[PDB]
A paper describes a structure:
Symmetry expansion of the pseudo-C2-symmetric dimer particles was used to classify individual F1/c-ring monomers into rotational states 1, 2 and 3 and resolve structures at 3.0- to 3.9 Å resolution. The E. gracilis F1/cring maps of rotational states 1 and 2 showed strong density for IF1, but weak density in rotational state 3. Subsequent focused classification of the IF1 binding site suggested complete inhibitor binding for rotational states 1 and 2, whereas rotational state 3 displayed a mixed occupancy, with a minority (34%) of particles containing IF1 and a majority (66%) not containing the inhibitor. Unlike the bovine ATP synthase, which displays a nearly equal particle distribution among the three rotational states, rotational state-3 (20%) is less populated than rotational states 1 (44%) and 2 (36%). Rather than reflecting dwell times during rotary catalysis, the distribution of rotational states is likely dictated by accessibility of the respective catalytic interfaces to IF1 binding, which for rotational state-3 may be sterically hindered by the proximity to the peripheral stalk. We observe this contact in all three rotational states, which provides the first observation of an interaction between the peripheral and central stalk in the ATP synthase. The position of the lumenal H5EG1 on the c-ring β-barrel remains largely unchanged in all three rotational states, suggesting a mechanism of transient rotor-stator interaction during c-ring rotation.
The mitochondrial ATP synthase is a membrane protein complex that generates most of the ATP in eukaryotic cells. The translocation of protons through the membrane-bound Fo part, mediated by subunit a, drives the rotation of a membrane-embedded c-ring and the attached central stalk, which together form the rotor. The torque of the rotor against the stator subunits induces conformational changes in the (αβ)3 headpiece, thereby triggering catalysis. To reveal how the mitochondrial ATP synthase is modulated by lipids and organised into a dimer shaping discoid cristae in Euglenozoan mitochondria, we determined the structure of the ATP synthase dimer from E. gracilis.
Numbering used by the authors:
A (entry chain H): 17 to 176
B (entry chain G): 3 to 255
C (entry chain I): 2 to 67
D (entry chain E), F (entry chain F), H (entry chain D): 379 to 501
E (entry chain B): 283 to 562
G (entry chain C): 283 to 422
The structure:
């Protein structure tokens, strides 16, 4: 026989992840952010001044050279602040924030949409839909209503 | 011999119809290839951090069979043909790496028949995604809910990597088991941080930050990043299907 | 709560995404991203010669695998 | 019983030539591309060098006996030799000469692998 | 009649040397009257004239499987039926190489006896569906319909070299049209018949409940030919002979047949099936 | 109108064997599959047994009136009979005989089903 | 003329019964002259000759959409264009069943009026893209 | 050598024209879109007006010699005239004369620029 004609490359090698070092110098002046929904990024290694996440334990904020950490993202909004004083908000659907001591952010999410493409009016009907689902006694619809309200209530308070 | 000319005319008109048919397949293929090339410009960023957790040194295949008990393979095949040697090279790879303790839950319709006819009992079933909508994270989650049924020890995802229009090669993701990945993480978090393979990134600060992370969140970290790995496999094999089909169409023409 | 009900974290994320795609305004963004939430796939396992659906895991997110 | 089969297999291969030249080998069931890989072997095995055409083919002429022809085709027909490549059946007589041609081909392939190895190391 | 094309070639060789005018394909033109003068003499006389007859089985050579030439068309125009022998089927392994879709007979049931009518009336309906489905590569290896089973076993039963007695054919086709021979595989269909005709298993193994119906006497033709199988006094005996032949085969012989792995015995069994394909 | 509509259907039906023979039924819209089903049903419906061909077919012929030959085709034209299977149209007369045949095919379908159950329980 | 192919058949019957020398498809030689004696009498005369005009619409029957036949191959070489009908379209409710690709009118615009030129200039630049789109797109 | 280089250029541009429809013009390398621009200049340069239709269309006809045409095509191939736009080569003759059209186009463009600037500054 032929001695293993094929040799498929390990696909992980195609990506170029960081080498998170313990740090033998100073800290950078601005985080290098990289936001990714399902497969495609909306932001790739952009310099940014600050970022504010919403997590299950609570609401967090980050700057350059924040302590190394990794954690969930509550289904809600995400605030970002560039060095130019402006801001950028993104509605998200869960995810995992990956902050580094070098100063780097890799927020892998499922969905990421700007606020501009959302209307409070369409959210309004979905509120009472979620409330009716929660009040409808059924394990198949109750938790679906609790989750729908879990995602509308942050938007409900972010819009107002 | 008035019949021979009608036979040859009829073969000519048949091929003339077949030409515009294959031309229609060609244009329909380019309609979705132009749609899907946009991923190429926005490629190779969503697992810049996932690899640092699950990547490993080039493990041998003869050793893991002895360490493991029930392997697993996710070969992503296609639903409709005129592609190329994709499903064929993916079948020659599995029979090339075939071994007693394995099981296959594939994707695509051609692995339905080809695997069952070349792999009698190891192959079990497959998943089929009608390509009316682009793939979703939920589809990869449905694939993980299929994989979790088997008590698998290592899951080798296989797919087609689109390096360019003239380059649709193979590629793989080696997924350890969740319990075994956590044991590797605990064994690694103690000792000094040293890379055991060229091009492998250090991950000790991550493995300790995760060591602080609670059980439910680490289990979501694992099912999440394995879902992204599966999803990248689907998007890359989809691009390879729409990329090699045009060559296996213009050669038919 | 939803955790102990039997649904996974992945079904949770997909449900949230399916809900978010509803509320956002109509445009090319929604026109594309609804593809990322529509459920159209299926599962099949081959019999001796016939095709059959391995329905042990539903594609709809409200249900619970068993 | 051997020749009746041999005719039958080539009869199927002719039907598949109309498709393989359209689509290709990869667009066929595993039964069909097997039968093709076996019929290409048979049709190539049907050739042989004659002592008269030494000027043309530059190969010594063989005299295939009847009994060894039937034992070879029967073995090739029952899949007794399927791992053997296609070109080993080309312009030869007797299965022993086939397996010596396959040995030469494998030896030359390995030799080119060592040669590309050393050419890469020196390069 | 052997090759009638040669009977026209001689007519051409004569007329053209006689300075007659040629026509289409160099023939004189009136060759249709030649073959009509010959073949319309074939007939079944009225009882006034003794009720005699004479059948004609003229043979016509063909080149590259065409029916477009002049002579072939003038002859098919006259003859009732035609038995198309396709080289693509001859070379396909099966012999006699008839292509049933191309070959017909313009008499039908009125020729054959009372027994063959009820069988052929089912066989035509069988092949009408098998011809439509047999183009499909068998993927329902266990969900293959009864039609894809029976049609292929019937084609295997058609394989012959020499002729077969009437009795020795109706039972062989009754076994298929009712599905008795659906459990065994395709290759062993003729060896199943070889025993069904020459090696009566129930007579050997003692499964003798049938009073008379046995395939050794060979004169039961003259009753099948008169009464027919679908009758009060032959249907159940037929069923209680074929179900036993099937059981004894599937239990004693098929169980041995699938258990062979040696090449020396495999070849011996294959040649045995080929011999049964020839002698029957 | 009914005759020109049917002929236009069959005119497209040929262009669909141009495609179905290569790709398959799966590569066509449900509105294309519908006209395929209708056309194939028309192609088999328009067949008929004759009493003179009893020698050939062994089946009784039907004398179909012109007026009855219009409300049945138009019925098939507007989906009045789409749930009705395919082979109910082959070699039958009016639509009454069609439904009479569909009841028979369904009867022998339940026959093979209950016989399969009894064979599974028995063996 | 309904139609010329039977006119040629008659000329064939006469020449062959008169022992004249036949040629392709048993027609004599001068059949192309037989038609050119006729069709070229069709013309638009000059104001010096009354400005009269004789328009000819010769019909010819093809067989299985063949055009390489001797008569059709000759009449096409004579006429100032043609109209090609297709039975594949006459059955598909496209009545008249023209075939715009093979149909030709060497007099493209100069015959038409002032109102038609601007319209036909659009229709040519519409059907030219319709055929490419209907040919490349699927059926469904 | 000039003619056969133009042939190889136009053949290559035809192949790249059969590839642009698949990938996109930006997919090509820096050298490929260079020769594509040169072919787009060449094919337009082949267009020549006529003294025949000068009364009909108004444009003049240029009787280009042989030697002058060779030096023009050799320049157009050597890359020493690439900055000139594509449309300048349309329906003209002789490289000494196309630049009159190029300068006329640049001057007319600067005129429209100055006209839009003063039209905006006035308001």
């Amino acid at each position: 026989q032929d001695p293993r004609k094929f040799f498929p490359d390990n696909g992980f090698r195609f990506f170029d992840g960081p080498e998170d070092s313990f740090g033998d110098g100073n800290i950078p002046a601005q985080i290098i952010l990289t936001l990714t929904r399902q497969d495609e990024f909306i932001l790739k290694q952009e310099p940014v001044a600050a970022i504010t996440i919403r997590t299950n334990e609570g609401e967090m904020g980050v700057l350059a050279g924040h302590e190394y950490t990794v954690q969930q993202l509550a289904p809600g909004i995400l605030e970002v602040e560039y060095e130019g004083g402006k801001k950028d908000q993104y509605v998200i659907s869960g995810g995992f924030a990956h902050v580094n001591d070098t100063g780097v952010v890799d927020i892998n999410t499922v969905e990421a949409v700007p606020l501009e493409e959302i209307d409070h009016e369409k959210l309004a009907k979905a509120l009472e839909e979620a409330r009716a689902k929660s009040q409808s006694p059924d394990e198949a619809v109750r938790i679906q209503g609790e989750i729908a309200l879990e995602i509308f209530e942050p938007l409900e308070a972010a819009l107002h | 011999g008035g019949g021979t000319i009608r036979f040859w005319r009829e073969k000519l008109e048949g091929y003339k119809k077949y030409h515009q048919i294959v031309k229609t397949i060609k244009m329909v293929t380019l309609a979705k290839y132009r749609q899907t090339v946009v991923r190429t410009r926005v490629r190779d960023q969503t697992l810049r951090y996932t690899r640092k957790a699950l990547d490993a040194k080039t493990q041998d295949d003869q050793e893991v069979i002895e360490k493991s008990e029930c392997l697993l393979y996710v070969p992503i095949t296609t639903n409709r043909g005129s592609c190329g040697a994709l499903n064929t090279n993916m079948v020659r790879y599995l029979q090339e790496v075939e071994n007693p303790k394995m099981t296959i839950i594939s994707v695509g319709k051609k692995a339905l028949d080809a695997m069952t006819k070349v792999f009698q009992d190891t192959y079990r079933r497959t998943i089929l995604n009608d390509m009316k909508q682009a793939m979703s994270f939920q589809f990869a989650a449905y694939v993980l809910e299929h994989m979790n049924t088997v008590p698998w020890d290592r899951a080798q995802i296989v797919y087609n990597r689109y390096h360019g229009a003239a380059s649709q090669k193979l590629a793989i993701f080696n997924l350890p088991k969740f319990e075994d990945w956590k044991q590797k993480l605990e064994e690694d978090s103690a000792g000094d941080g040293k890379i055991e393979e060229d091009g492998l990134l250090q991950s000790l600060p991550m493995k300790t930050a995760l060591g602080e992370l609670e059980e439910t969140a680490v289990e979501d970290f694992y099912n999440f990043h394995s879902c992204l790995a599966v999803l990248n496999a689907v998007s890359e094999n989809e691009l390879s299907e729409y990329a090699a089909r045009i060559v296996a169409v213009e050669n038919q023409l | 709560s939803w955790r102990d009900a039997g649904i996974s974290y992945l079904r949770y994320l997909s449900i949230v995404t399916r809900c978010i795609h509803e509320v956002q305004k109509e445009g090319p963004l929604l026109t594309k991203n609804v593809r990322f939430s529509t459920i159209g796939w299926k599962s099949l396992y081959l019999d001796h010669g016939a095709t059959k659906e391995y329905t042990a895991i539903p594609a709809e997110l409200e249900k619970i695998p068993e | 019983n051997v020749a009746m089969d041999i005719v039958e297999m080539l009869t199927k291969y002719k039907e598949l030539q109309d498709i393989i030249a359209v689509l290709g080998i990869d667009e066929l069931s595993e039964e069909d591309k097997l039968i093709v890989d076996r019929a290409r072997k048979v049709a190539k095995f049907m050739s042989q060098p004659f002592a008269v055409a030494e000027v043309f083919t530059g190969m010594k002429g063989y005299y295939v006996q009847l009994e060894d022809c039937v034992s070879d085709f029967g073995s090739l027909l029952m899949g007794q030799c399927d791992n053997i490549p296609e070109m080993a059946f080309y312009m030869v007589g007797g299965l022993d000469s086939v397996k010596e041609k396959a040995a030469k081909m494998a030896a030359e392939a390995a030799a080119m692998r060592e040669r590309a190895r050393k050419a890469a190391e020196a390069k | 009649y052997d090759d009638l094309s040669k009977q026209a070639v001689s007519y051409r060789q004569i007329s053209l040397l006689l300075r007659r005018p040629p026509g289409r394909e160099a023939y004189p033109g009136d060759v249709f009257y030649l073959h009509s003068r010959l073949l319309e003499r074939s007939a079944m006389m009225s009882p006034q004239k003794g009720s005699g007859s004479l059948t004609s089985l003229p043979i016509v050579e063909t080149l590259s499987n065409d029916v477009t030439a002049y002579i072939v068309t003038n002859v098919i125009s006259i003859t009732d039926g035609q038995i198309y022998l396709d080289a693509k089927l001859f070379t396909g392994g099966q012999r006699p190489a008839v292509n049933i879709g191309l070959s017909v007979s313009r008499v039908g049931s009125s020729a054959q006896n009372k027994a063959m009518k009820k069988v052929g009336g089912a066989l035509k309906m069988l092949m009408g569906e098998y011809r439509k489905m047999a183009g499909e590569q068998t993927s329902g290896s266990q969900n293959v319909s009864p039609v894809m089973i029976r049609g292929a076993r019937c084609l295997q039963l058609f394989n012959q070299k020499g002729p077969s007695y009437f009795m020795d054919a109706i039972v062989a086709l009754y076994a298929v049209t009712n599905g008795y021979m659906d459990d065994v595989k395709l290759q062993y269909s003729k060896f199943y018949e070889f025993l069904l005709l020459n090696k009566d298993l129930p007579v050997l193994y003692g499964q003798v409940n049938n009073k008379y119906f046995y395939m050794y006497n060979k004169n039961l033709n003259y009753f099948i030919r008169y009464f027919g199988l679908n009758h009060e006094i032959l249907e159940p005996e037929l069923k209680k002979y074929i179900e036993i032949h099937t059981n004894l085969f599937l239990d004693n012989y098929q169980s041995r047949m699938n258990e062979l792995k040696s090449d020396e015995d495999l070849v011996q069994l294959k040649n045995l099936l080929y011999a049964c394909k020839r002698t029957v």
